[PDB]
Ligand binder design. Structure first.
Ligand SMILES: OC[C@H]1O[C@H](OC[C@H]2O[C@H](OC[C@H]3OC(O)[C@@H](O)[C@@H](O[C@H]4O[C@H](CO)[C@@H](O)[C@H](O)[C@@H]4O)[C@@H]3O)[C@@H](O)[C@@H](O[C@H]3O[C@H](CO)[C@@H](O)[C@H](O)[C@@H]3O)[C@@H]2O)[C@@H](O)[C@@H](O)[C@@H]1O
Ligand SMILES: *[C@@H]1O[C@H](CO)[C@@H](O)[C@H](O)[C@H]1NC(C)=O
Ligand SMILES: [Zn+2]
Length: 1015
C-alpha cells in the first residue's frame, strides 16, 4: 500500500541535483534581458483562431516587518492600501487585486465598520479581490520548520474561512530567498492546486526558460508515483517589480509603471519615463507592450500569459489606483480591438490565470514536465549568493525553535480538557500562534530586518513564550490534581517552567533555584511533560540550594541522581582570561525522568543533612596554567587542578571520547574493541572583502576560505559523573561544551562575537570519512536532500540551510550533526562538516536593509553529534536524490527540538497531587509523531472537535529488530468519540469519513490530519 521511499528512483523530466551537475552557470551579458538572451517570436503564431490571452494581475507586496515594524507599516502604508483597494474595487467593477498577507488583512478588517466589512465581503465574493496562499505571512522557506510553515498557513486560512468564507487554492510566493519543496508538500495536502515562485538562481531561470520548463509538476524527491505533485509556475526574470514582469526588457517595461512619472517621487533607472496613454500615442505604446508580452509568452507552453502588475507597498494612494487603471484600460481597449495583435488582454486574478492554463492543457494544447529538487542557494546576480541569511541574527533563529516547541506543548496540554472562557486559554494560544506565525515572515526568522524590527519580533516572541507557559502550567495543575480538590485561579502560577537551554547558561540568569532548608521547606514537587507519542526517558536537571538532595517518584521509589556544581564562565577583563566560577550556594541535581507518551510524570526532591544514599557527586578538574582555588560551599568533592593535557571520558556503556589539550574533541570510540575514529572540532573565521561586494544580512561573500581562530592556552573544565560528564573550554568568542550522558554527545556553544566586526565564526568537524563531494542537509526539518559540492561555483554557493541537521557518509561510516536552531553550513572538503555560529558585518549588502549586522548578542546553540557504522544499512541507490536518518539520529534530533518540559511547583504544598498522566496512552512506533494536537472548539460547542496532524518520517533499516509498539489511533485518545474524519492539514475541509471512528496511521514520509468529534 505504502510507496517505497528508499529503493525506487523517481523518473522526472528535471531533477535539480542532476541539472546542477550539468549546468555551466556562466554569467554572460544576454542583452536587455541581462541574464537571458534576445527572445524571438514568429508573429504568425497567434491569429484569429488562436489569440494570446493576457491576464494583468495587480498586487502589492506588504512585508509584516522589515524596515519598519508590523504596526508602523500598518499605520503608514497598509491601512491606506487596503482602504483604497476597497474603495477603488467597489467603484470599478472590472478592476482586480490579489492579497497574500493575512496578518495585515485581519488587522485591517477588525478595525472596519460593519458597512465596510460588508462591502469587503462583496468584492471578495464577486472575485475582484482574491486571496493568494492565505497564510499569516509569506514565509521564509530556508530556515522555517515545516511545523511552523503549517502553523502560519493554518492561522491565515482559518481566519479567511471564518470571516471571508474562502480558502485559496493558489499560492503566491514572490519574495522568499530561494524556494523549498516543503511548500508544495504542505500545500498539496492543504487543498492547493497551483503555486507560483520567483526567487530562483538566474542561471536556473535561463536554463528552464530555454526548454520551456518554467511551469512544471513539482513532486517530492522520493515520490515514484507522483501523487505529491503540485503545478508550479516559476516567474522568468530578475524581480517581481513592474520593470521585470511585462517582458524581457526592463527599459521598456518601466514605461508601463505609471507611478514613475515624477509626482510620486519615483523614476525609471533606465532613463526613459512612462508617458500618459492618449489617442495619439496608444498605437505606438501598444506596439511596444505587445512585443514585450509576446516575447515573455515564448518562454511558456500555452496561449495564456501571466503579467503581474505591482511592487512593494503599492496601490497606496487613490491617485496611484487611477493612474495605473486608466492607462491600462486605454491600452486594453486599443489592443483588444486591433485584430492584427491577436491579443485579448484584461485585469485578472491569479486563480483566473491558472484556470485558463489548465483549460488549455485539457484542450491538449500543452503537456507539462515533471520536476523534483529544491531552489537553493539563490543568487540574483553574479556571485551574490544569499547564504548569509541562513545564519543572520542566530539568537532569534534559536528562539524560533524554542517557541515552536512551547506552542506545540501548550496546545497539546490544554487540548485534553474543555476550558471555561474565563481561563483565557484560547486567547493566550491565539496570541502565541500569531506571534510565532508572524516571525516566519521572510524578513523575520531570516535575520534581514532593521535592528528595531528585530527587537519588536523578539518582544512579541517573549510575550508568546509567557502565554505558552501560563497555558502549560494551568493544564498541568488540572491534569495532575484530584478533580474534587482542583480549585483553579486562572491568573495564578501553580508551576514555573524550568528550561536548561533557553536562553541558556551565560545568556540570561532566568532559572529559579529550588530553595530547600530544614528551617524553610523540606521538599519540592517537579513534573515532566513528554509531547512525543512514545514512552521516553531523558536526563533532567534542576537548580537546588543544597547539594544534599534525593529524588523519589510519587510511589516514593528512590531515583538515582547526580549532583554537580553550577559553573558560570567569565571574561575576566583583569587577567584577560576566560574561566569558570562555581556557585557556593546553588547546585545542579540531575536524574533520569521516565514519562508516558503525550504524558506527565511527578517527582519529589527532598533535602537531608548529609549525602543521600541514591545521589552521587561529580568530580571536577580545572586544566590551566596558573590556577587559583575554586571553593564550592557544601559540595562534598574538592575541585582538582592540572596543566592542560589530553583527556578521555566514557559515560555508561556509551562511546569513549578523547579531547585535545585545548578541550576540543579529537576522536570517538564507539565500543570497547573498536577504533578511535578521528573526529576533530575546530573553530575558524571568515572575513569580508576589502574591495568589491560586501557580505551583509543577506549575502555571504567571504574573502577566501576560513582561517583558524587563535586559541592561546584556553582554560578547560572537566566534570566527571556517573550520569553526566562534560568538557567545557573558554575559547575566544565561544564557550564550547561537550556533554556525555551515555549516548551520542550533546554539544553546546555559548557564542558571543563581541565587537569582532566583519567576522563570521564557523564550527568545523574534520574526519577521514571518504564522502568526496557529497553531503546531506535537511529541508525545513521534514526531509534530507543530497547535496553535491560544486567547485565550478564559489564557496558561498556551496552553503545551504541547515534547519535541523546535516550528514556525511562513505560505504562504512556516517557522521550526523543535528541542530537545535537553523544555521548555514556546508561540506567544503571530503570528510568535513561545518556550520556557521554567528556573523557580525559592518556593511550593508545593497538589498534594501540599509544597515549591517552589528546587533549581536550571546546565544546558546545546541547540537547532537552521532557517529555510526552504516555498512549494514539499506540505503538509497547512488542516483536517489534523498537521504534518511538512522533511529539514533532521529531520536537525537527530537531530543533537541522537543525535549521534556519541566515544571516546578510554586507553593509549599500541592494538595491532591497525582504521580502520572497518560500511562494508558499508546506508545507509537518511533518514526510516528503527533506533530499537532489542537482542540478546535470552544467550551460552548455541543460537539467538541480535536484536530491532530500525524507525521511519519522514514528511518533506515540497519538490522535492529526494534519490535512491539502499539497502534496509535488518535481519534480514540479522548473519550466519547462520535465521528472521525480525515481532513486537509489546516483542518478546514473534510476529506474522508472514517469507518469505526478509527484514524489509520500514515505511510513513511506522509503527513495526515484527523479531526475527532465528541459528544
Ligand atoms: O532584497 C530583499 C528584499 O526584497 C524586497 O524589498 C526590495 C526593495 O528593493 C528596492 O530597494 C532597494 C534599495 O532600498 C533602499 O532603500 C536602500 O537601502 C538602497 O540601497 C542604497 O543605499 C544604501 C544605504 O545603506 C547603500 O548601502 C546601497 O549601496 C545603495 O546605494 C537599496 O538599493 C526597491 O525595489 C524597493 O521597493 C521600493 O522602491 C521601488 C522603486 O522606487 C518602488 O517601486 C516600491 O513601491 C517601493 O517603494 C524594495 O522594497 C522585499 O521583498 C523584502 O522583504 C526583502 O527583504
Ligand atoms: C460560503 O460559500 C458557499 C459556496 O462555496 C455558499 O454556499 C455559502 O452560502 C457561503 N456563505 C456562507 C457559507 O456563510
Ligand atoms: Zn518582502
Amino acid at each position: 500500500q505504502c510507496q517505497d521511499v528508499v529503493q525506487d528512483v523517481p523518473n522526472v523530466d528535471v531533477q535539480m541535483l542532476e541539472l546542477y551537475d550539468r549546468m555551466s552557470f556562466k554569467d554572460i551579458d544576454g542583452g536587455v534581458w541581462k541574464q537571458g538572451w534576445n527572445i524571438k517570436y514568429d508573429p504568425l503564431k497567434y491569429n484569429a483562431h488562436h489569440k494570446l490571452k493576457v491576464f494583468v494581475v495587480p498586487h502589492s507586496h506588504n512585508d509584516p516587518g522589515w524596515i519598519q515594524t508590523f504596526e508602523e507599516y500598518y499605520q503608514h502604508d497598509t491601512k491606506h492600501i487596503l482602504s483604497n483597494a476597497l474603495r477603488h474595487l467597489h467603484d470599478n467593477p472590472e478592476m482586480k487585486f490579489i492579497w497574500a498577507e493575512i496578518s495585515y488583512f485581519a488587522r485591517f478588517y477588525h478595525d472596519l465598520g460593519e458597512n465596510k466589512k460588508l462591502q469587503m465581503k462583496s468584492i471578495v465574493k464577486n472575485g475582484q479581490l482574491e486571496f493568494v496562499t492565505g497564510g499569516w505571512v509569506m514565509p521564509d522557506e530556508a530556515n522555517s520548520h515545516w511545523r511552523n510553515v503549517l502553523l502560519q498557513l493554518t492561522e491565515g486560512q482559518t481566519w479567511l474561512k471564518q470571516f471571508m468564507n474562502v480558502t485559496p487554492t493558489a499560492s503566491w510566493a514572490i519574495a522568499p530567498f530561494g524556494h523549498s519543496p516543503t511548500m508544495p508538500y504542505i500545500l498539496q495536502k492543504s487543498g492547493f492546486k497551483n503555486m507560483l515562485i520567483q526567487r530562483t538562481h538566474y542561471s536556473v531561470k535561463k536554463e528552464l526558460a530555454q526548454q520551456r520548463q518554467l511551469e512544471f509538476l513539482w513532486r517530492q524527491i522520493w515520490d515514484n508515483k507522483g501523487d505529491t505533485a503540485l503545478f508550479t509556475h516559476m516567474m522568468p526574470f530578475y524581480s517581481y517589480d513592474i520593470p521585470h514582469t511585462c517582458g524581457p526588457d526592463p527599459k521598456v517595461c518601466c514605461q508601463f509603471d505609471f507611478k514613475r512619472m515624477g509626482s510620486f517621487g519615483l523614476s525609471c533607472p533606465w532613463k526613459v519615463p512612462p508617458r500618459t496613454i492618449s489617442d495619439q500615442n496608444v498605437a505606438a505604446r501598444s506596439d511596444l507592450l505587445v512585443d514585450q508580452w509576446k516575447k515573455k509568452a515564448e518562454l511558456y507552453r500555452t496561449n495564456v500569459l501571466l503579467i503581474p502588475l505591482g511592487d512593494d507597498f503599492r496601490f497606496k494612494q487613490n491617485t496611484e489606483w487611477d493612474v495605473q487603471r486608466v492607462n491600462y484600460e486605454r491600452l486594453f481597449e486599443h489592443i483588444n480591438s486591433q485584430a492584427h495583435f491577436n491579443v485579448q488582454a484584461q485585469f485578472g486574478t491569479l486563480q483566473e490565470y491558472f484556470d485558463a492554463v489548465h483549460q488549455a492543457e485539457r484542450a491538449g494544447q500543452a503537456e507539462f514536465p515533471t520536476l523534483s529538487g529544491d531552489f537553493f542557494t539563490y543568487a540574483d546576480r553574479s556571485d551574490n549568493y544569499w547564504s548569509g541569511y541562513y545564519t543572520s541574527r542566530p539568537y532569534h533563529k534559536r528562539m524560533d525553535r524554542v517557541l515552536m516547541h512551547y506552542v506545540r506543548a501548550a496546545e497539546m496540554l490544554s487540548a485534553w480538557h474543555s476550558w471555561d472562557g474565563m481561563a483565557r486559554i484560547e486567547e493566550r494560544l491565539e496570541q502565541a500562534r500569531r506571534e510565532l506565525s508572524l516571525f516566519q515572515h521572510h524578513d523575520g526568522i531570516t535575520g534581514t530586518a532593521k535592528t528595531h524590527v528585530v527587537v519588536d519580533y523578539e518582544q512579541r516572541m517573549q510575550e508568546a513564550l509567557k502565554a505558552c507557559q501560563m497555558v502549560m502550567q494551568q493544564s498541568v495543575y488540572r491534569l495532575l490534581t484530584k478533580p474534587s480538590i482542583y480549585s483553579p485561579d486562572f491568573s495564578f502560577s501553580y508551576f514555573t517552567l524550568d528550561d536548561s537551554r533557553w536562553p541558556g547558561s551565560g545568556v540570561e540568569d532566568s532559572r529559579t533555584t529550588i530553595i530547600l532548608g530544614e528551617d524553610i521547606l523540606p521538599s519540592k514537587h517537579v513534573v515532566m511533560h513528554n509531547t512525543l507519542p512514545h514512552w521516553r526517558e531523558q536526563l533532567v536537571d534542576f537548580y537546588v540550594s543544597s547539594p544534599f538532595v534525593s529524588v523519589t517518584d510519587l510511589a516514593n521509589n528512590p531515583v538515582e541522581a547526580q549532583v554537580s556544581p553550577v559553573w558560570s564562565w567569565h571574561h575576566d577583563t583583569l587577567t584577560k582570561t576566560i574561566h569558570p566560577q562555581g556557585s557556593t550556594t546553588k547546585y545542579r541535581i540531575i536524574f533520569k525522568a521516565r514519562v508516558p507518551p503525550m504524558g506527565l510524570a511527578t517527582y519529589v526532591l527532598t533535602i537531608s543533612d548529609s549525602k543521600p544514599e541514591h545521589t552521587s557527586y561529580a568530580s571536577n578538574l580545572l586544566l590551566r596554567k596558573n590556577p587559583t582555588s575554586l571553593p564550592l560551599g557544601q559540595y562534598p568533592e574538592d575541585v582538582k587542578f592540572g596543566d592542560p593535557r589530553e583527556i578521555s571520558l566514557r559515560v555508561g556503556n556509551g562511546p569513549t571520547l578523547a579531547f585535545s589539550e585545548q578541550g576540543l574533541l579529537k576522536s570517538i570510540q564507539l565500543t570497547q574493541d573498536s577504533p578511535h575514529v578521528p573526529v576533530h572540532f575546530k573553530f575558524l573565521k571568515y572575513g569580508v572583502r576589502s574591495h568589491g561586494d560586501r557580505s551583509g544580512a543577506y549575502l555571504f561573500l567571504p574573502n577566501g576560505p576560513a582561517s583558524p581562530v587563535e586559541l592561546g592556552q584556553p582554560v578547560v573544565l572537566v566534570t566527571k559523573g556517573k550520569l553526566e560528564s562534560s568538557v567545557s573550554v573558554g575559547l575566544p568568542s565561544v564557550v564550547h561544551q561537550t556533554i556525555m550522558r551515555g549516548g551520542a554527545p550533546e554539544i553546546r556553544n555559548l557564542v558571543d562575537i563581541g565587537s569582532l566586526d566583519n567576522t563570521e565564526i564557523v564550527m568545523r568537524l574534520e574526519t577521514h570519512i571518504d564522502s568526496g563531494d557529497i553531503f546531506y542537509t535537511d529541508l525545513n526539518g521534514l526531509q534530507f536532500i543530497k547535496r553535491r559540492r560544486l567547485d565550478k561555483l564559489p564557496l558561498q554557493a556551496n552553503y545551504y540551510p541547515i534547519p535541523s541537521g546535516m550528514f556525511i557518509e562513505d560505504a562504512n561510516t556516517r557522521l550526523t550533526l543535528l541542530t537545535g536552531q537553523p544555521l548555514g553550513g556546508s561540506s567544503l572538503a571530503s570528510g568535513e562538516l561545518e556550520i556557521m555560529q554567528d556573523r557580525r558585518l559592518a556593511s550593508d549588502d545593497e538589498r534594501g536593509l540599509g544597515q549591517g549586522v552589528l546587533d549581536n548578542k550571546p546565544v546558546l546553540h545546541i547540537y547532537r553529534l552521532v557517529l555510526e557504522k552504516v555498512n549494514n544499512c539499506v540505503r538509497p541507490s547512488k542516483l536517489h536524490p534523498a537521504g534518511y536518518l538512522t533511529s539514533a539520529a532521529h531520536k537525537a534530533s527530537q531530543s533537541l527540538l522537543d525535549p521534556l518540559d519541566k515544571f516546578i511547583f510554586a507553593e509549599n504544598e500541592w494538595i491532591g497531587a497525582q504521580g502520572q498522566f497518560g500511562g494508558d496512552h499508546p506508545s507509537a512506533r518511533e518514526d510516528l509523531d503527533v506533530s499537532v494536537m489542537r482542540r478546535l472548539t470552544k467550551s460552548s460547542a455541543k460537539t467538541q472537535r480535536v484536530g491532530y496532524v500525524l507525521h511519519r518520517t522514514n528511518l533506515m533499516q540497519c538490522g535492529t529488530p526494534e519490535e512491539h509498539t502499539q497502534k496509535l489511533d488518535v481519534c480514540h485518545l479522548l473519550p466519547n468519540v462520535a465521528r472521525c474524519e480525515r481532513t486537509t492539514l489546516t483542518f478546514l475541509q473534510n476529506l474522508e469519513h472514517l469507518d469505526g471512528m478509527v484514524a489509520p496511521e500514515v505511510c513513511p514520509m506522509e503527513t495526515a490530519a484527523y479531526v475527532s468529534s465528541h459528544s
